[PDB]
């Protein structure tokens, strides 16, 4: 059972879903959906921060317990002050 779904409420009246994958061998991933595309991300720092696997994307997901923030480019905010719902 290596896959799970989280839903967050974020600033400016928005919702962010994240699918988390945690393999039995210890590899962690996250998938978000932005602009009608699903973007797979890999764990890069450990709260827990994930970065897009496809280098053509610059999305980064920073999580800390039940909170999160999604940025792009030079840590420019996309979704801020996210909290687990």
State the residues that interact with Na ion by CB under 5 A.
1-2, 11, 22, 24, 57-58, 72
Give the span between the Cα atoms of 55 and 10, in whole angstroms: 25
Residue 58 interacting partner from Na ion, its own copies, none (CB closer than 5 to 8 Å by kind): Na ion
Give the span between the Cα atoms of 56 and 47, in whole angstroms: 25
**Could you tell me if 21 and 29 are in contact, meaning their C-beta atoms sit under 8 angstroms apart?**
yes
Stretch that binds its own copies, among 33-41, 43-51, 59-67, 76-84 (CB under 8 A): 33-41
- Give the one residue of 12, 37, 55, 73 binding its own copies; rule: CB under 8 A: 37
Least Å from the CB of residue 16 to its own copies: 11
| Distance set, CA 41 to CA 15, 27, 67 (Å) | 18, 11, 18
Place of tokens 């945690």: 22
Residues at the contact surface with its own copies, assessed by CB under 8 A: 2-5, 17, 19, 21, 23-25, 27, 29, 31, 33, 36-38, 40, 42, 53-54
């Amino acid at each position: 059972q290596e896959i799970s779904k989280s839903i967050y409420t974020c600033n400016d009246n928005q919702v962010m879903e994240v699918i988390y994958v945690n393999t039995e061998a210890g590899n962690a991933y996250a998938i978000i959906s932005q602009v009608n595309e699903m973007i797979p991300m890999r764990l890069m720092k450990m709260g827990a921060n994930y970065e897009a696997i496809d280098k053509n994307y610059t999305y980064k997901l920073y999580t800390k317990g039940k909170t999160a923030e999604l940025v792009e480019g030079d840590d420019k905010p996309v979704l801020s002050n996210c909290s687990l719902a």
